[PDB]
């Protein structure tokens, strides 16, 4: 229907620290298990540190298309 | 959910758990029990230490033509349960006493 | 134990099939008083009559499958 006052909501709600907030995703905040968390942190650590040349050379990993082509050829 | 390919332990023996014969051992004489039998149609049985009230009732039903309204029990200091069994009004404990012996 | 004062209520109670026994008592008052007790599965309902004939009539009225206990 189309009536002004049957469907009128008082949705102008959000000011800080008053009324329950709306909602967010929270993935950033969930605690996670110890393992998996360490892996996450490990990755970060790896990124962060000065990586020696040899080790670095183990992550320049071709272009995707070319790799796929190579794989196909090998097949 | 379990799905064992064969069961762990299979007691093929006849059950050790106490049947009617073994659960309820014998009636009591003694002046007290005789009096009980006379006056208020309560039969007194010595029973196994590990008899429940339900169990005793069941035993009585099986072993005799007895219907029991109520069963009180107690553990004697001789390591036996003594079960005071009050019969329903339809039965005369005296008659049933006679029947048993 | 409950008391009853509406004769009709008492009668209704009597009519109801869980009422196994009636107890009818005679009491020398300080004339013959009569207490009518019905023994229901739940409660023992009692009516007191000052007047003997009335009491008698109500007793007569009571269903003849009731298990009447004349106390004294």
């Amino acid at each position: 229907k189309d009536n002004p006052l049957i469907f009128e909501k008082k949705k102008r709600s959000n000011i800080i620290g008053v009324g329950v907030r709306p909602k967010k995703d929270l993935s950033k905040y969930v605690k996670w298990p110890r393992y998996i968390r360490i892996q996450r942190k490990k990755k970060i650590l790896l990124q962060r540190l000065k990586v020696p040349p040899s080790i670095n050379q183990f992550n320049h990993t071709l272009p995707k298309s070319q790799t796929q082509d190579l794989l196909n050829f090998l097949k | 959910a379990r799905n064992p390919k064969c069961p762990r332990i299979v007691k093929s023996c006849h059950s050790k758990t106490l049947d009617k014969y073994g659960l309820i051992k014998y009636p009591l004489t003694s002046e007290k029990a005789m009096k009980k039998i006379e006056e208020i149609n309560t039969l007194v049985f010595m029973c196994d230490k590990r008899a429940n009230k339900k169990n005793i009732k069941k035993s009585v039903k099986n072993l005799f033509g007895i219907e029991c309204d109520k069963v009180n029990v107690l553990n004697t200091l001789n390591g036996d349960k003594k079960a005071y069994v009050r019969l329903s009004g339809e039965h005369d404990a005296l008659e049933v006493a006679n029947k048993i012996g | 134990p409950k008391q009853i004062t509406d004769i009709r209520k008492f009668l209704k109670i009597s009519r109801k099939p869980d009422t196994t026994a009636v107890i009818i008592m005679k009491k020398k008052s300080k004339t013959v008083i009569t207490k009518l007790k019905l023994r229901t599965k739940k409660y023992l309902y009692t009516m007191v009559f000052a007047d003997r004939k009335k009491a008698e009539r109500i007793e007569n009225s009571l269903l003849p499958s009731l298990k009447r206990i004349y106390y004294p």
Partner: protein, 140 residues
């Protein structure tokens, strides 16, 4: 002036209708052996229309927005009068009749009142603030 003119909306403060909002229909202010207090006579809403979404189907919406009313004579000292006045949007004499307060079919009258309220809510008009106020359940 005389705060409680017929049609003014009020909030009951006392009784079973504690925080319910309602329209006064006929003020008396004459103390008697029967009612020794100035009393107001009020037609109000007990159970407001529940919140409704556009998505919902029309029958279900109608069911949702049923409004269960009541008619009660009440001491003026128990009612908080509001600025809101609904003399216009209802024919007020038609809501509650003094004589019918006594009468047997009071429930029928109440039902009728409720129906009227529902109708009003359905057709708002332009849109009065008073009617909006009446619509919303008071949260306390």
């Amino acid at each position: 002036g005389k705060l409680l003119k017929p049609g003014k909306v009020i909030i009951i403060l006392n009784g079973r209708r504690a925080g319910k909002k309602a329209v006064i229909v006929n003020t008396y202010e004459g103390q008697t052996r029967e009612r020794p207090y100035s009393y107001c006579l009020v037609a109000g809403i007990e159970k407001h229309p529940l919140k409704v979404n556009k998505s919902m189907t029309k029958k279900k919406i109608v069911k949702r927005s049923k409004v269960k009313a009541f008619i009660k004579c009440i001491n003026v000292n128990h009612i908080l009068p509001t600025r809101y006045q609904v003399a216009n949007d209802f024919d007020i004499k038609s809501l509650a009749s003094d004589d019918v307060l006594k009468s047997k079919n009071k429930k029928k009258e109440v039902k009728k009142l409720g129906k009227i309220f529902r109708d009003k809510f359905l057709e708002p008009v332009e849109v009065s603030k008073d009617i909006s106020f009446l619509h919303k359940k008071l949260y306390f």
